């Protein structure tokens, strides 16, 4: 400190070091928008083609969970089994768990699993994952020309072109949105029953006449001794052609005629599966999934894709297009570009409000050099610590300037108020100031490390969100007081010009200078208005209590949240008809979704990425969904036009037209939160009760919940209802008689109605699945199961009606499991007064009277916010004693350092007044903004108590007149920073357009807890002092006169 | 020693013998633990009005307990002190040579009569034109 | 009869062991009395 | 570098026509030229394979391929020449 | 087993590659394809990798690979191996 | 080696400015480093 | 891992010898083993 005061070279080695260093991180430092914030969470995928929800539950399902065990910090494990054929297991773990240990784990517990899997899941495959739900950028293939099937360009997007993009810098996974080919064959009935031949015989000679067959070689060893040659024999191998499938034999006829697959069946290249047609515009199209690499740059990554999406371009057959529904990047773009407009546009207020104020070139350069070090090297130690550039940590910055700038403004004004006060020599003046206030920096770098870390400590999900804010601000905030107490002092010492005792600066110049005159004035009103409500000082300490229990009115009534929603330039509506829906009652509806965004919308949608098949409801021809991208917000320039407003007009032009239940919404910030104000429950089967005992239950306690609309609304089943199905008895006995296989049976109507993947064959250099099914027009209607005959031992054809009966029944399209058991998740929310824990505590007692056998488990953010909300008042709670102890050091009273703790609610009040009358919300960037604005009360306060104290201790000044002169000598940096502070929040304030949502968040509370803060602390702050040293005995000194 | 990578590293190993062990060893469950030796305790469980047998017990412990408590971390390895219920059918020779039977025939008759069977779906994709019914299609289900 | 993952902490998988059959008693058939015949766990605690 | 490859086109036909399965004659040929991996068997108490494989001089040139016969459903023997053609490609053994 | 180069390829090598995609710390992939129906596929890593977190986010990415294999190779069997490239010794053995 | 060629001028530029910076810190003057910096083409000329 | 003053020892086939054989041998080393008292206490087999 007294150190480089003489060493301005040294203090100029280290800023130039923290510059590089801190340059360097930000020049090679990752960035997304947000960081991994979400628990790992791995997925278990299979699909047993053909498969209802119980034949997979019972044979897959109940299978792999069996096997889940042994491994590492498991949290909970859910699991979904559709009657789409398809399994989905995923597990969760503790926050921190490594995800790729959790995923190994995982894939090879599995791995000891499949041995018990049927083997048609087994060759169908079972996939292992990391699940987290954050794309990057979805692109999509279109065809303009209307030349080629989305089955048709699906497969060029995996054969030309997903290799080449998955190779891509920083690209962390490419999915393919749609089927490469495979090999289609589809069955007709009678052809196979006038040949005398049943599906069973068209897959042996698929196997037979599409496979590989090991040979061996010439002069193979061990050889004969003197021999020839060597060379590899090859023998058959697998087809390639529609044309070669069509060739292969099935039998040949008495007479010496041919029957052919050819004849028995169409064959082409197809889909390797036909649950989703995906449109883009009303136009088929495929699709690519891209995910941020772990540790790569977000920006430099969609550039890269581009680029390498370029290079194909003439490559392409006749109009075919990329183009990009969604991409992350633009919005970050904004996000990055409006942080440093902020954080530029914030020093620069410091140097204005620092030059029309100490009118000096030099002295106005001193923050100007002094925050940037402080901001370069912030990025240097978030390098250090691993984190990224994100928007959490960009508005980690911003919500922290009011700190650093205070440290930069704090030490050059002392140096400059003493100069014109005593008439110093910079150099001394340096010398002396610092002095003053180098106990107060070291006393509140570890004050306000102990309000900033404890939130870093906080448990889960959102524990993990405020770590970024946390580590973010303290890395900054600890280098802006170690370049107050090392650059600073130089600076001011070596670039500073001396001002004549008793200066002022009053009169002296015209054209630039005539406020000072005016300054000095306002000055003497503030002394002489704080001394004077001295006296009755006890009816001031009741207008304070007002601002405590105002406080903790507005403490209440506020609503809370975590991350408010932004204009992405994007949303999606979603299609909901009726169970047992038809693909094509759905993409009429989807049509005329479409066509309400391009007709009726025109101006503000780019196009409609329209998904028939894929729900979040689940998956089946009943669901679909219509991603809207929109132009960019450059040209929807209203309110009316923005995200907000097209969503709630959409809802309402779908819901007084329709057949079919049509939401509408755009994505939260981080695309796996929950509702704030809201819950997921699971109603779990303990006993032995089914299904329908469950349903029971769960109907008893969903009617309970509507008993009482003032606590929860719109709580409701998060899966599906039981729908009819048909189904077929084998009378075994008569299929025993007649001379039929059970097993014939049963494959020759898999196969036919669910189809089979036989074979792999190789298209165009590229391995390929082979599918048998029955052509669409004979597996429509239950009465169509009479064109299909089995060959029964004695080899003549058997009808179904001979050996089979049918009926109808309900059966359920999608069975829940929680941790292992049978369970059917309810979700729901906490209506307008109440709050998530009240509404909690509410179903626990509605579910603590279903029938006897019957749980429930809270999961996902219900689960988080159980075991992460017993730490606010705990944490706090040590922040306090901590705050406490170290004023206690910094002064030397264990009373003293509660004339500065009782400036907490200064700020609050304001934060709370401001976010109140905006109508805004108590999130995460309001939290974090609350610990700022304590941060500068706090630190406002800390050098008026001390500069109190040191003219009270060092110099005897009189109690009632030492706190009048720390008042009067710190009134002026207070309304620097503060003005500066606020103009520099203003356009954070009333934003619009992109990331208005978090700016307006981070300004709202800031500006006017602020305003507040400062406007009320230079009267509060003198009065707590002369409150609280008042209650000190006067035996050893008099606190009221001189001494030394 | 990592005991994760350890147990990640035999693993890898042990995929490359286990295709080659009989079918009725793979179908048994190969399973491959990072496990202390000593018990760390012993969780007993019993009726009070014995109103139900030991294998009766045995069975519900491991219908209803050792899952959870076998997937919970840190637990490495889990011993059931009984049995879980099966379907036991005790054959007689004496019937089965009656009927001209063999434990085969009986095999055969258990495999063919008790099964899920994947049957596809009515208007099940991709479909006709105009097609406005879609349903599963139920067959064979396991026996209960 | 339950054995510690290598490098598990002996009581803190003994607690959640304890709290996992919390959960599943509620549940039980009736007069299912659990018991506890072998724990190293209570030794540890009262040792230290 | 680009090894030749004799290539054998077991017509499917003929084989059906004169009564040899399909298999049948496969696993032959493969067992004659390739040798084949039976099962497992113990030496000193070690277990190790069991192979079985042609005597070198019967899987050497191309003419070797008529020493072989596959029986056919009634009981008699069929040469390979009655249902199988042959002809050389090219190709690589190493593709990097 | 016993098929040739190009068909091992496009069948086995090919496909892995492919999921051997979004991987922490890789520099560069090599591999090849054996007329032995042998394929043998190596990533080098970043210097100073983590090797045996390498090994497990390969093999998780292979083990997504596997169902699309053929049934003869994922019952052959498929290694995730941390790798040399030279040996350290030859020990021989020879009667006297 | 084509990472040890072109690594090479970064790490000399970097070595450089490191010891310039050392010596500015030590020896206070701005210009000390300044001199024994156009000491190194000395050395490295015999190198070569 | 350990018992007052206990050992491990561990009695290996390495030329195909065979079970019973190397059941023969263990008996051998076994008697020798009792031979003497005054060195070792129930040096016994510990498999079946």
């Not at 954080?343 to 009118?359: G, K, N, P, R, T």
Request: hydrophobic share 45%; proline share 4%.
């Amino acid at each position: 400190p007294n150190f480089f005061i003489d060493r301005p070279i040294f203090a100029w080695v280290i800023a130039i070091i923290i510059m590089l260093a801190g340059g360097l991180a930000i020049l090679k430092l990752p960035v997304a928008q947000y960081p991994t914030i979400a628990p790992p969470a791995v997925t278990i995928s299979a699909s047993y083609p053909g498969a209802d929800a119980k034949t997979v539950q019972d044979t897959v399902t109940q299978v792999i969970e069996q096997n889940m065990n042994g491994i590492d910090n498991l949290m909970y494990m859910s699991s979904n089994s559709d009657s789409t054929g398809t399994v989905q297991i995923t597990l969760t773990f503790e926050s921190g768990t490594d995800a790729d240990i959790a995923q190994v784990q995982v894939q090879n517990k599995l791995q000891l699993a499949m041995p018990l899997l049927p083997q048609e899941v087994q060759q169908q495959g079972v996939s292992v994952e990391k699940s987290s739900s954050s794309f990057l950028m979805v692109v999509g293939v279109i065809n303009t020309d209307g030349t080629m099937t989305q089955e048709d360009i699906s497969d060029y997007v995996a054969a030309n072109m997903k290799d080449a993009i998955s190779r891509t810098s920083g690209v962390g996974d490419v999915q393919l949105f749609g089927s490469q080919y495979a090999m289609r064959i589809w069955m007709n009935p009678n052809e196979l029953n006038k040949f005398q031949l049943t599906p069973v015989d068209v897959i042996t000679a698929i196997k037979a006449q599409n496979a590989q067959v090991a040979a061996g070689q010439l002069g193979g060893t061990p050889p004969v001794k003197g021999q020839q040659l060597n060379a590899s024999i090859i023998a058959q191998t697998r087809l390639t052609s529609t044309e070669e499938f069509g060739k292969i034999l099935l039998k040949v006829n008495q007479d010496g005629s041919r029957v052919l697959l050819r004849d028995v069946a169409k064959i082409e290249l197809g889909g390797e599966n036909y649950d989703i047609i995906a449109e883009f515009n009303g136009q088929p199209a495929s699709g690519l999934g891209i995910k941020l690499a772990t540790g790569a740059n977000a920006l430099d990554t969609a550039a890269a894709i581009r680029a390498e999406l370029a290079k194909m371009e003439p490559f392409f057959p006749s109009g075919l297009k990329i183009v990009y529904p969604y991409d992350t990047t633009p919005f970050v773009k904004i996000s990055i570009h409006e942080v440093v407009k902020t954080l530029v546009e914030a020093i620069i207020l410091v140097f204005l409000v620092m030059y029309l104020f100490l009118q000096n070139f030099r002295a106005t350069l001193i923050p100007t050099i002094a925050v940037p070090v402080v901001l370069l090297g912030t990025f240097a130690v978030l390098a250090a610590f691993g984190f990224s550039i994100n928007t959490l940590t960009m508005f980690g910055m911003v919500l922290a300037i009011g700190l650093l700038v205070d440290d930069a403004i704090v030490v050059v004004e002392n140096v400059e108020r003493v100069m014109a006060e005593e008439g110093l020599p910079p150099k001394e003046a340096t010398r002396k100031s610092m002095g003053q206030i180098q106990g107060a920096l070291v006393g509140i770098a570890m004050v306000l490390s102990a309000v900033f870390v404890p939130m870093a400590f906080f448990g889960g999900s959102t524990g993990a969100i405020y770590r970024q804010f946390s580590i973010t601000i303290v890395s900054a905030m600890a280098l802006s007081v170690l370049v107050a107490l090392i650059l600073t002092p130089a600076l001011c010492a070596t670039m500073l010009k001396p001002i004549a005792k008793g200066d002022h600066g009053e009169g002296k110049k015209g054209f630039f200078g005539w406020f000072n005159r005016m300054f000095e004035k306002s000055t003497h009103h503030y002394t002489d208005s704080v001394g004077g409500i001295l006296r009755s000082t006890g009816r001031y300490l009741v207008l304070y209590l007002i601002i405590v229990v105002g406080m903790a009115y507005l403490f209440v009534r506020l609503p809370s949240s975590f991350l408010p929603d932004e204009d992405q330039g994007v949303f999606m509506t979603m299609v909901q008809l009726p169970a047992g829906a038809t693909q094509e009652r759905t993409q009429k509806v989807l049509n005329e979704v479409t066509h309400y965004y391009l007709t009726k919308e025109k101006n503000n949608v780019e196009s409609v990425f329209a998904v028939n098949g894929f729900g979040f409801a689940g998956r089946g021809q009943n669901t679909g969904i219509a991603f809207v991208s929109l132009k960019d917000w450059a040209d929807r320039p209203g309110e009316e036009n923005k995200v907000e407003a097209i969503t709630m007009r959409a809802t309402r032009a779908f819901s007084q037209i329709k057949d079919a239940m049509v939401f509408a919404f755009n994505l939260p910030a981080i695309v796996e939160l929950g509702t704030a104000t809201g819950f997921d429950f699971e109603l779990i089967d303990q006993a032995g009760l089914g299904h329908e005992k469950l349903t029971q239950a769960r109907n008893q306690l969903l009617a309970e919940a509507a008993k009482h609309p003032d606590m929860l609304t719109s709580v409701r089943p998060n899966g599906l209802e039981d729908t009819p199905q048909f189904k077929i008895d084998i009378d075994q006995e008569k299929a025993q008689a007649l001379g039929v296989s059970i097993n014939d049976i049963n494959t020759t109507l898999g196969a036919a109605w669910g189809g089979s993947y036989v074979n792999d064959f190789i298209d165009r250099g590229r391995v390929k699945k082979v599918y048998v099914m029955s052509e669409a027009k004979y597996r429509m209607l239950p009465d169509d199961i009479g064109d299909w005959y089995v060959r029964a031992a004695d080899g003549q054809m058997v009808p179904f009606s001979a050996f089979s009966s049918s009926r109808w029944e309900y059966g359920s399209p999608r069975l829940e499991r929680y941790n292992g058991l049978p369970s059917m998740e309810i979700l729901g929310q906490a209506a307008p007064g109440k709050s998530t824990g009240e509404a909690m505590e509410l179903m626990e007692q509605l579910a603590s009277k279903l029938p006897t056998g019957v749980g429930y488990d809270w999961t996902g953010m219900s689960y988080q916010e159980r075991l992460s909300g017993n730490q606010a008042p705990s944490l706090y709670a040590i922040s306090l004693i901590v705050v406490f102890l170290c004023l206690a050091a910094l002064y030397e009273s264990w009373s003293i350092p509660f004339s500065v703790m009782l400036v907490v609610p200064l700020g609050v009040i304001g934060a709370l007044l401001a976010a109140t009358f905006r109508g805004l919300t108590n999130d995460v960037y309001f939290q974090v903004g609350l610990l700022t604005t304590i941060g500068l009360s706090a630190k406002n306060a800390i050098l008026i108590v001390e500069f109190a104290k040191d003219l009270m201790d060092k110099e005897g000044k009189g109690l009632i007149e030492a706190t009048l002169d720390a008042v009067r000598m710190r009134l002026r940096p207070i309304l620097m920073t503060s003005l500066a502070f606020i103009l520099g929040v203003m356009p954070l304030v009333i934003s619009t357009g992109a990331g208005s949502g978090a700016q307006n968040a981070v300004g709202t509370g800031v500006m006017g807890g602020m305003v507040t803060a400062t406007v009320l602390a230079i009267f509060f702050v003198p009065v707590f002092f002369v409150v609280v040293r008042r209650r000190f005995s006067r035996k050893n000194e008099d606190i009221e006169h001189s001494h030394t």
